[PDB]
């Protein structure tokens, strides 16, 4: 045996060869196998413009002893016709008169036949035992096209008993070859299928696009390769090494001997950071919660993603994501966490603060008045929690309350232009934008996170020249948009004291050569440190405290979902207003980590297009439930 063959180099009467191994497996972080190779055998016939009538049914009669066949493809016509083949007996006795007419030459053959494959279907068709549809189901498949088109006879479900029996008699069977190939096998089901990706099927060879890049390394378009995501991304490890000989030709045939240069070897096995038992439970809770939220009003809500990370080193432990339709039909959408972007809202604020501290615009514990701002001509902004009054508050109480206006004042102070009632808005915020977007970037927001998959988007980044109103919105998460992974990289950076680490999913690579044994560690796949935030540890602890307050103080936004986590949790929410077909909606985001005192888990969650609240759905619960399940025993 097995190795659907590749190539034959040819110099001056000298030959070289190359054959195909199977791909690395793919394992969870405790070794549980996620992606295996299974064997698919398959019997082929090869017909001739020079073997018609009977030597068909002669091969087919022999084969209907080594294999059993699926007759779900036979047709009344083929039955009809095969009847004539098989009963020259009763057939000759059906066309007694027509025989003569054909013979005297007053009906053609055509007509004779059509009149015959019309004469029977009742009594004498039910003269076909199971034996014969068996030999027919092979015969049928033994011609569809002429020439040497190697038509498959049995494809699905070819038992090792069957493949052996018939490779064993290939001699007695003229026309019949047998192959075996390797096809991926997914023990855990749909789970993470979209992230694993896909391999072309050699019928495909390499597909039209990925070419060049595949050929500028050295492949056949016969070759099966990695068509997407993990398979695409660790192609050069999950692929084997190839079997390779060199030959000595002479005379008009002679080959004196070969020397084995490269014996072969299966792909290196790849271990993921996933914990599949966590992964599965997350998918579970997600759905319980989508169904819970739909039955409280959220019938238009249409996405729901969740990343879970270990913030001390970037490990992605789970990654989940459904699309929802208007009646609840889930589709898997795990790639959604880093290929889609959303407006996230009030949950970037801890990064905005960290941009103010860096630039002297504010400093730790600076208090300010939350009140309706009034701008020239009559524009007003306000914090939801305080639509009408006036309230002085810290930064860390700004995070707890999710005060938009503490963040607008910070934003203006950063733009050289502190708030004064009546004021007009700086007509040129270019350099404040640059400073503030550079601060957010430092915690992951706005950049690609570095993840080891393709198609990571850094989010929609529209410009900042003279749109002050936007510049402000950007300080409360309502201009630039972000992937749920960025949210998860940012909350993790807060959680590990200002280190922004590359998320990864690939964890370790293994030298596998024997089958099913793992074999030695080859390479680790580190979550690299991208950058440290430009901030004092007193600045970082202010934010951390604000996050802890937002989850554990009676007036925190995340009180009713995170206060009774089995271990203390910290985080932050956002509720961005959005529109869908002109109706009013909210995205709704969560981020957090636990335990507060030495975090081992960090997460982001996104729901999109929930209803606008009077009734505050509590989609954080999904987050509380994951922290509770993760930490069930400490
Ligand atoms: C942050 O997003 C901020 N604003 C909103 O939530 C808005 N509408 O809420 C119904 C909104 C969108 S654009 C704008 N000027 N206001 C705060 N977010 C939270 C939170 O979830 O912490 C609140 C609870 C409401 S106010």
XYZ file of C-alpha atoms and ligand atoms in Angstrom:
660
model
C 1.375 -3.497 0.677
C 0.000 0.000 0.000
C 1.407 3.339 -1.120
C -0.302 4.888 -4.218
C 2.865 5.698 -6.105
C 4.350 9.043 -7.153
C 7.344 9.416 -9.520
C 10.072 7.883 -11.777
C 13.239 9.969 -12.471
C 15.143 8.995 -15.657
C 18.758 9.969 -16.504
C 20.854 7.766 -18.923
C 19.177 4.365 -18.248
C 18.829 5.016 -14.487
C 15.599 5.106 -12.437
C 14.413 6.563 -9.082
C 11.080 5.933 -7.285
C 8.922 7.428 -4.448
C 5.845 6.132 -2.470
C 3.356 7.606 -0.007
C 3.255 7.015 3.737
C 0.501 8.002 6.212
C 0.147 11.311 8.040
C 0.934 12.096 11.635
C -1.900 11.649 14.084
C -3.293 14.532 16.068
C -3.690 14.217 19.827
C -5.226 16.172 22.727
C -2.901 17.304 25.562
C -3.363 14.042 27.541
C -2.655 11.872 24.467
C -6.313 11.108 23.632
C -6.253 10.723 19.836
C -8.270 13.355 17.945
C -7.320 12.530 14.367
C -6.150 9.140 13.089
C -5.587 7.439 9.749
C -8.019 4.611 8.885
C -7.537 2.283 5.897
C -9.975 2.340 2.962
C -9.654 -0.489 0.462
C -11.364 -0.518 -2.869
C -11.663 -2.952 -5.797
C -11.331 -1.720 -9.381
C -12.112 -3.278 -12.795
C -10.441 -2.182 -16.038
C -12.481 -2.842 -19.204
C -11.512 -3.218 -22.839
C -12.767 -2.270 -26.308
C -11.726 -5.944 -26.843
C -13.678 -7.974 -24.248
C -17.453 -7.671 -24.496
C -20.252 -10.246 -23.992
C -19.456 -12.952 -21.485
C -15.929 -12.691 -19.984
C -17.675 -9.922 -17.954
C -20.121 -12.307 -16.317
C -17.252 -14.782 -16.013
C -15.101 -12.482 -13.882
C -18.245 -11.301 -12.046
C -19.389 -14.909 -11.308
C -15.947 -15.703 -9.777
C -15.856 -12.484 -7.678
C -19.373 -12.991 -6.243
C -17.595 -15.619 -4.102
C -14.908 -13.412 -2.508
C -17.046 -10.342 -1.843
C -20.655 -9.530 -0.938
C -22.364 -6.606 -2.707
C -24.764 -3.672 -2.185
C -27.567 -3.885 -4.760
C -29.051 -0.464 -3.863
C -27.835 0.719 -7.340
C -29.376 -1.951 -9.573
C -32.150 -0.887 -11.948
C -35.229 -2.705 -13.347
C -33.553 -2.201 -16.733
C -30.304 -4.040 -15.688
C -32.488 -6.721 -14.000
C -34.686 -6.993 -17.177
C -31.610 -7.199 -19.433
C -29.631 -9.525 -17.108
C -32.753 -11.761 -17.186
C -32.298 -12.328 -20.941
C -28.548 -13.106 -20.425
C -29.510 -15.619 -17.685
C -32.605 -17.290 -19.157
C -32.095 -17.975 -22.938
C -34.487 -20.691 -21.791
C -37.715 -18.798 -21.071
C -36.676 -15.741 -23.120
C -36.554 -17.721 -26.394
C -40.072 -18.953 -25.476
C -41.377 -15.396 -24.965
C -40.465 -14.104 -28.455
C -41.813 -17.037 -30.502
C -43.608 -14.871 -33.107
C -41.230 -11.865 -33.035
C -38.246 -14.186 -33.612
C -39.681 -15.066 -37.041
C -40.464 -11.445 -37.873
C -36.882 -10.238 -37.045
C -35.695 -13.182 -39.077
C -37.802 -12.531 -42.234
C -36.423 -9.013 -41.755
C -39.680 -7.172 -41.099
C -38.683 -5.887 -37.624
C -35.217 -4.761 -36.740
C -33.137 -5.857 -33.805
C -33.922 -2.595 -31.919
C -37.629 -3.241 -31.980
C -37.277 -6.937 -31.244
C -35.378 -6.029 -28.068
C -37.504 -3.136 -26.799
C -40.405 -5.541 -27.320
C -38.574 -8.129 -25.145
C -37.401 -5.767 -22.302
C -41.164 -5.100 -22.327
C -42.454 -8.675 -22.347
C -41.417 -9.653 -18.802
C -41.504 -8.135 -15.280
C -44.230 -10.137 -13.560
C -43.809 -13.901 -13.166
C -40.406 -14.597 -14.769
C -38.586 -11.642 -13.311
C -39.165 -12.987 -9.772
C -36.933 -15.823 -10.997
C -33.778 -14.054 -9.693
C -32.333 -15.447 -6.410
C -30.057 -13.398 -4.165
C -27.218 -15.147 -5.970
C -27.848 -13.342 -9.277
C -28.394 -9.706 -8.204
C -25.048 -10.278 -6.510
C -23.341 -11.139 -9.798
C -25.356 -8.353 -11.479
C -24.308 -5.655 -8.992
C -20.699 -6.346 -10.006
C -21.496 -6.695 -13.747
C -23.377 -3.380 -13.733
C -20.363 -1.575 -12.326
C -18.063 -3.473 -14.766
C -19.110 -1.089 -17.577
C -20.229 2.542 -17.573
C -17.468 4.019 -19.743
C -15.316 2.271 -22.348
C -11.537 2.420 -22.834
C -9.436 1.829 -19.680
C -11.355 3.913 -17.065
C -10.628 1.926 -13.849
C -14.182 1.776 -12.511
C -14.726 1.045 -8.815
C -16.790 -2.047 -8.025
C -16.894 -1.805 -4.181
C -15.634 1.380 -2.492
C -17.419 1.632 0.836
C -16.965 -1.076 3.503
C -14.434 -3.466 2.043
C -13.592 -5.969 4.824
C -9.980 -7.178 5.332
C -11.448 -10.660 4.665
C -12.617 -9.398 1.219
C -9.501 -7.418 0.200
C -7.308 -10.473 0.999
C -9.467 -13.111 -0.689
C -9.427 -11.113 -3.962
C -5.832 -9.793 -3.995
C -5.147 -13.553 -3.511
C -6.874 -14.585 -6.773
C -5.997 -11.571 -8.924
C -4.487 -14.114 -11.377
C -7.713 -16.117 -11.789
C -9.499 -12.644 -12.145
C -8.646 -10.780 -15.399
C -9.425 -7.068 -15.156
C -9.347 -6.672 -11.370
C -6.902 -4.543 -9.344
C -7.079 -3.686 -5.643
C -5.746 -0.630 -3.754
C -5.778 0.575 -0.135
C -5.527 4.199 1.044
C -5.421 6.204 4.236
C -8.310 8.537 5.185
C -8.599 10.653 8.347
C -10.767 9.261 11.158
C -12.350 11.474 13.811
C -13.068 9.560 17.028
C -14.737 12.508 18.747
C -17.028 13.425 15.930
C -17.798 16.841 14.751
C -15.930 18.348 17.673
C -13.235 20.690 16.332
C -13.552 19.365 12.798
C -13.348 22.862 11.297
C -10.104 23.595 13.117
C -8.494 20.233 12.222
C -9.077 21.071 8.589
C -8.966 18.709 5.665
C -6.705 16.760 3.323
C -7.309 16.534 -0.437
C -8.283 13.052 -1.739
C -5.680 12.371 -4.522
C -8.608 12.349 -6.902
C -8.373 16.037 -5.931
C -4.581 15.854 -5.804
C -3.627 19.359 -4.750
C -6.480 21.835 -5.412
C -6.322 24.728 -7.830
C -5.415 27.486 -5.349
C -2.709 26.236 -2.932
C -0.529 25.232 -5.910
C 2.641 27.202 -6.673
C 3.262 27.458 -2.914
C 2.938 23.630 -2.789
C 4.945 23.116 -6.010
C 7.748 25.581 -5.087
C 8.746 22.920 -2.525
C 8.382 19.787 -4.610
C 5.074 17.955 -4.926
C 2.982 16.022 -7.415
C -0.541 17.193 -8.215
C -1.258 13.480 -7.690
C -0.265 14.006 -4.007
C -2.818 14.387 -1.250
C -1.969 17.410 0.888
C -3.374 19.588 3.662
C -6.227 21.707 2.354
C -6.901 23.889 5.452
C -6.190 24.956 9.074
C -4.270 22.563 11.250
C -3.635 20.122 8.352
C -2.664 23.087 6.223
C -0.519 24.618 8.965
C 1.452 21.621 10.197
C 1.594 20.042 6.756
C 5.342 19.689 6.751
C 5.312 17.785 10.089
C 2.108 15.765 9.739
C 3.324 14.621 6.277
C 5.597 11.626 6.101
C 8.930 11.056 4.444
C 8.712 9.076 1.218
C 10.017 5.668 0.221
C 12.863 6.132 -2.307
C 15.043 3.712 -4.366
C 17.630 4.138 -7.178
C 18.017 1.617 -10.028
C 20.500 0.375 -12.661
C 19.037 -0.280 -16.140
C 20.849 -1.974 -19.075
C 20.136 -3.790 -22.442
C 16.362 -3.495 -23.300
C 15.092 -4.329 -19.805
C 17.861 -5.361 -17.358
C 17.962 -4.020 -13.770
C 20.986 -5.386 -11.936
C 19.974 -4.132 -8.429
C 18.695 -1.143 -6.376
C 20.018 0.576 -3.238
C 17.372 1.788 -0.745
C 18.152 5.476 -0.115
C 15.125 6.390 2.051
C 12.993 3.616 3.573
C 9.982 5.808 4.369
C 8.507 6.829 7.777
C 5.058 8.036 8.961
C 4.283 11.637 9.808
C 5.405 13.128 13.080
C 2.559 13.118 15.559
C 1.138 16.466 16.651
C -0.202 17.081 20.131
C -2.582 19.942 20.772
C -3.102 22.094 23.813
C -6.761 21.194 23.723
C -8.168 19.322 26.630
C -10.881 17.411 24.745
C -12.865 16.714 27.896
C -13.012 20.456 28.541
C -13.614 21.113 24.836
C -16.593 18.763 24.859
C -18.072 20.218 28.046
C -17.817 23.756 26.675
C -19.683 22.769 23.494
C -22.223 21.257 25.888
C -22.746 24.276 28.130
C -22.746 26.611 25.105
C -25.827 24.857 23.714
C -27.635 24.595 27.049
C -27.031 28.360 27.301
C -27.992 29.224 23.732
C -31.212 27.350 24.291
C -31.649 29.055 27.631
C -31.184 32.524 26.122
C -33.412 31.885 23.078
C -36.205 30.912 25.486
C -35.762 34.282 27.258
C -36.109 36.463 24.125
C -32.878 36.072 22.231
C -34.369 34.385 19.188
C -32.448 36.566 16.697
C -29.090 36.138 18.393
C -27.016 34.546 15.723
C -23.485 33.830 16.904
C -22.037 32.643 20.177
C -18.299 32.083 20.586
C -16.022 31.254 23.527
C -12.279 30.915 23.840
C -10.618 29.472 26.907
C -6.968 29.884 27.533
C -4.311 29.339 30.048
C -3.121 32.928 30.423
C 0.281 32.074 31.909
C 1.369 30.621 28.574
C -1.081 30.977 25.742
C -2.369 27.397 25.612
C -5.771 27.293 24.042
C -7.650 24.799 26.099
C -11.037 25.050 24.401
C -12.406 26.970 21.472
C -16.056 26.839 20.566
C -18.596 28.632 18.470
C -22.023 28.134 16.978
C -23.937 30.096 14.393
C -27.633 30.223 15.216
C -30.520 30.593 12.775
C -33.911 32.047 13.609
C -35.292 28.784 15.038
C -32.183 27.449 16.755
C -30.347 25.305 14.211
C -26.735 25.282 15.379
C -23.855 25.118 12.923
C -20.298 24.607 14.173
C -18.181 27.791 13.855
C -15.027 27.263 15.810
C -12.911 29.129 13.303
C -15.218 32.034 14.149
C -13.169 32.941 17.192
C -10.310 34.282 15.067
C -11.676 34.818 11.537
C -14.686 36.983 12.485
C -14.704 40.378 14.063
C -17.308 42.109 16.197
C -18.008 45.327 17.997
C -17.214 44.480 21.617
C -18.049 47.489 23.670
C -17.440 48.289 27.231
C -14.941 45.532 27.867
C -11.895 47.105 26.253
C -11.895 49.749 28.939
C -9.090 48.210 30.964
C -6.897 48.642 27.953
C -7.984 52.253 27.428
C -7.003 52.995 31.058
C -3.635 51.405 30.469
C -3.165 53.812 27.541
C -3.999 56.785 29.713
C -1.451 55.792 32.363
C 1.264 55.320 29.753
C 0.721 58.805 28.322
C 0.263 60.834 31.555
C -3.327 61.585 30.529
C -4.316 60.173 33.861
C -2.648 58.430 36.790
C -3.618 55.672 39.124
C -6.628 56.341 41.246
C -7.369 59.638 39.596
C -10.974 60.354 40.390
C -13.354 62.203 38.121
C -16.994 63.188 37.963
C -19.296 60.925 35.952
C -21.959 63.236 34.556
C -23.658 63.883 31.248
C -21.165 65.632 29.020
C -22.559 68.427 26.854
C -20.725 69.314 23.683
C -21.136 72.276 21.381
C -24.363 72.451 19.448
C -26.021 70.033 21.831
C -24.472 66.607 21.572
C -24.478 64.637 24.798
C -22.860 61.436 26.107
C -23.569 59.751 29.376
C -22.801 56.627 31.330
C -25.659 54.167 31.458
C -25.411 53.713 35.224
C -25.805 57.445 35.762
C -28.016 58.951 33.119
C -28.869 62.012 35.165
C -26.881 62.550 38.333
C -23.274 63.449 39.156
C -20.943 61.031 40.870
C -17.201 61.166 41.467
C -15.460 57.844 40.917
C -12.084 56.226 40.661
C -10.700 54.447 37.696
C -11.296 51.159 39.483
C -14.871 52.133 40.152
C -15.146 53.177 36.499
C -14.361 49.539 35.534
C -16.778 48.197 38.122
C -19.594 50.435 36.867
C -18.559 50.479 33.153
C -18.688 54.259 33.090
C -18.354 55.476 29.533
C -17.659 59.073 30.640
C -14.573 58.386 32.789
C -13.226 56.965 29.539
C -14.294 59.933 27.445
C -12.599 62.272 29.861
C -9.492 60.150 29.787
C -9.708 60.198 25.974
C -9.960 63.971 25.858
C -7.234 64.515 28.485
C -5.122 62.298 26.208
C -5.934 64.668 23.283
C -4.502 67.740 25.056
C -8.072 69.042 25.588
C -9.647 68.312 28.976
C -13.390 68.316 29.138
C -15.265 71.551 29.839
C -19.012 71.786 29.459
C -20.071 73.343 26.170
C -16.699 72.588 24.595
C -16.267 71.691 20.933
C -14.492 68.568 19.889
C -10.809 68.735 18.771
C -11.122 68.848 14.982
C -7.915 66.816 14.660
C -7.405 63.704 16.803
C -4.820 62.021 14.610
C -2.135 61.873 17.236
C -4.475 60.843 20.048
C -5.849 58.036 17.910
C -2.286 56.875 17.193
C -1.350 56.948 20.878
C -4.543 55.227 22.058
C -4.622 52.561 19.313
C -0.970 51.896 20.118
C -1.887 51.374 23.783
C -4.721 49.010 22.939
C -2.416 47.139 20.524
C 0.001 46.491 23.407
C -2.595 44.223 25.063
C -3.532 42.496 21.833
C -6.480 44.623 20.656
C -5.912 45.594 17.036
C -3.136 43.174 16.184
C -3.123 39.589 15.044
C -2.577 37.530 18.159
C 0.002 35.304 16.499
C -2.127 32.150 16.585
C -0.761 29.099 14.746
C -3.547 28.947 12.201
C -4.281 30.692 8.907
C -6.711 33.450 8.322
C -6.390 35.297 11.604
C -7.906 38.800 11.186
C -6.755 41.710 13.331
C -10.091 43.398 13.105
C -11.532 46.307 11.185
C -9.367 49.349 11.767
C -10.886 52.482 10.189
C -8.923 55.715 10.279
C -8.569 58.454 12.846
C -7.969 61.836 11.258
C -10.719 64.304 12.129
C -13.604 62.135 13.418
C -13.355 62.977 17.094
C -16.741 61.390 17.801
C -15.240 58.124 16.653
C -11.976 58.569 18.558
C -14.132 58.761 21.678
C -16.162 55.712 20.732
C -12.875 53.836 20.275
C -12.120 54.320 23.987
C -15.281 52.388 24.900
C -15.027 49.712 22.285
C -17.395 51.019 19.664
C -15.306 51.795 16.619
C -12.535 49.359 15.868
C -13.768 45.775 15.941
C -12.048 42.688 17.303
C -11.862 38.851 17.177
C -12.839 36.905 20.260
C -9.286 35.637 20.387
C -7.944 39.181 20.789
C -10.275 39.706 23.684
C -8.892 36.501 25.095
C -5.284 37.553 24.557
C -5.953 40.907 26.198
C -7.665 39.589 29.329
C -4.848 37.072 29.649
C -2.275 39.853 29.474
C -3.992 41.632 32.349
C -4.062 38.306 34.197
C -0.341 37.556 33.839
C 0.800 40.988 34.904
C 1.360 42.568 31.564
C 2.810 39.907 29.293
C 1.137 39.543 25.915
C 1.698 35.943 24.838
C 1.055 34.399 21.468
C -1.889 32.041 21.702
C -1.123 28.617 20.398
C -2.980 25.380 19.879
C -0.085 23.276 18.683
C 1.698 22.143 21.882
C 4.307 19.517 21.089
C 5.664 17.553 18.175
C 6.755 13.906 18.346
C 9.238 11.764 16.463
C 6.756 8.976 15.917
C 7.854 6.133 13.599
C 6.111 3.037 15.001
C 2.356 2.816 14.845
C 0.262 3.924 17.845
C 3.270 4.193 20.129
C 3.934 7.945 20.544
C 7.689 7.965 20.481
C 10.084 10.661 21.519
C 9.488 14.336 21.940
C 10.921 16.227 18.959
C 9.963 19.897 19.422
C 7.867 21.928 21.833
C 5.579 24.631 20.504
C 5.981 27.597 22.841
C 3.606 30.472 23.348
C 6.117 33.242 22.773
C 6.032 36.566 24.597
C 5.042 39.189 22.031
C 5.732 42.253 24.227
C 5.333 43.529 27.785
C 2.887 46.361 28.385
C 4.439 49.752 28.965
C 3.102 50.014 32.463
C 4.008 49.987 36.134
C 2.858 47.111 38.219
C 0.857 49.668 40.225
C -0.994 50.571 37.001
C -1.716 46.898 36.224
C -3.039 46.186 39.748
C -5.424 49.075 39.441
C -6.979 47.413 36.401
C -6.960 43.975 37.962
C -8.717 45.462 40.959
C -11.320 47.008 38.687
C -11.922 43.667 37.025
C -12.196 41.950 40.418
C -14.642 44.615 41.522
C -16.791 44.181 38.403
C -17.373 40.526 39.367
C -17.566 40.728 43.147
C -18.986 44.097 44.290
C -22.775 44.439 44.578
C -22.651 47.254 41.983
C -20.291 45.438 39.595
C -21.689 44.659 36.146
C -20.683 40.996 36.442
C -21.860 40.478 40.019
C -24.807 38.179 39.269
C -22.813 35.690 37.305
C -19.339 35.478 38.782
C -19.625 36.291 42.486
C -20.089 32.641 43.564
C -17.602 30.987 41.312
C -15.957 28.100 43.150
C -12.811 30.183 43.036
C -12.629 33.970 42.904
C -12.895 35.374 39.393
C -12.184 38.746 37.835
C -13.162 40.252 34.559
C -15.242 42.733 32.627
C -18.241 42.930 30.358
C -19.364 44.936 27.379
C -22.785 45.533 25.818
C -22.313 47.188 22.440
C -25.404 48.496 20.648
C -25.674 47.276 17.047
C -28.362 46.904 14.417
C -29.560 43.963 12.354
C -31.904 44.636 9.445
C -32.562 48.015 10.953
C -33.766 46.613 14.326
C -31.947 47.417 17.604
C -29.701 44.789 19.111
C -26.730 44.277 21.367
C -23.538 42.344 21.121
C -22.689 41.196 24.636
C -19.182 40.259 25.672
C -17.437 38.844 28.704
C -13.818 38.356 29.638
C -12.286 37.010 32.770
C -9.748 34.914 34.574
C -9.496 32.789 37.695
C -8.381 32.365 40.253
C -7.970 36.032 40.987
C -4.809 35.442 42.948
C -2.848 33.241 40.518
C -4.773 32.704 37.319
C -4.724 29.375 35.552
C -7.709 30.037 33.250
C -8.772 33.034 31.172
C -11.688 33.282 28.773
C -13.603 35.489 26.376
C -17.241 35.040 25.344
C -19.235 36.725 22.590
C -22.923 36.681 21.878
C -24.241 38.750 18.951
C -27.577 40.418 18.290
C -29.322 39.734 21.509
C -32.290 41.931 22.325
C -31.704 45.372 23.711
C -32.243 45.059 27.439
C -34.730 46.042 29.791
C -34.324 42.355 30.725
C -30.593 41.654 31.268
C -30.041 38.131 30.038
C -27.105 36.645 31.991
C -25.006 34.989 29.353
C -22.038 35.205 31.636
C -23.472 32.093 33.323
C -21.803 30.042 30.610
C -18.574 31.588 31.890
C -19.332 30.921 35.525
C -20.189 27.330 34.626
C -16.850 26.794 32.867
C -14.898 28.173 35.813
C -16.871 25.921 38.140
C -16.360 22.806 36.063
C -12.674 23.491 35.493
C -11.991 23.985 39.215
C -14.276 21.236 40.611
C -11.465 19.854 42.792
C -8.773 22.037 44.417
C -20.374 49.958 27.045
O -20.535 49.272 26.058
C -21.413 50.865 27.702
N -22.457 51.210 26.729
C -23.478 50.386 26.501
O -23.586 49.359 27.128
C -24.509 50.798 25.465
N -25.786 50.426 25.478
O -26.273 49.593 26.497
C -27.646 49.194 26.439
C -23.946 51.684 24.445
C -23.568 51.312 23.203
S -22.914 52.718 22.392
C -23.181 53.715 23.825
N -22.837 55.037 23.847
N -23.742 53.001 24.790
C -21.779 50.164 29.069
N -21.857 48.747 29.107
C -22.380 48.118 30.082
C -21.789 46.808 30.566
O -22.292 45.791 30.027
O -20.916 46.910 31.452
C -23.601 48.445 30.763
C -24.061 47.583 31.676
C -24.406 49.501 30.085
S -23.280 50.925 29.745
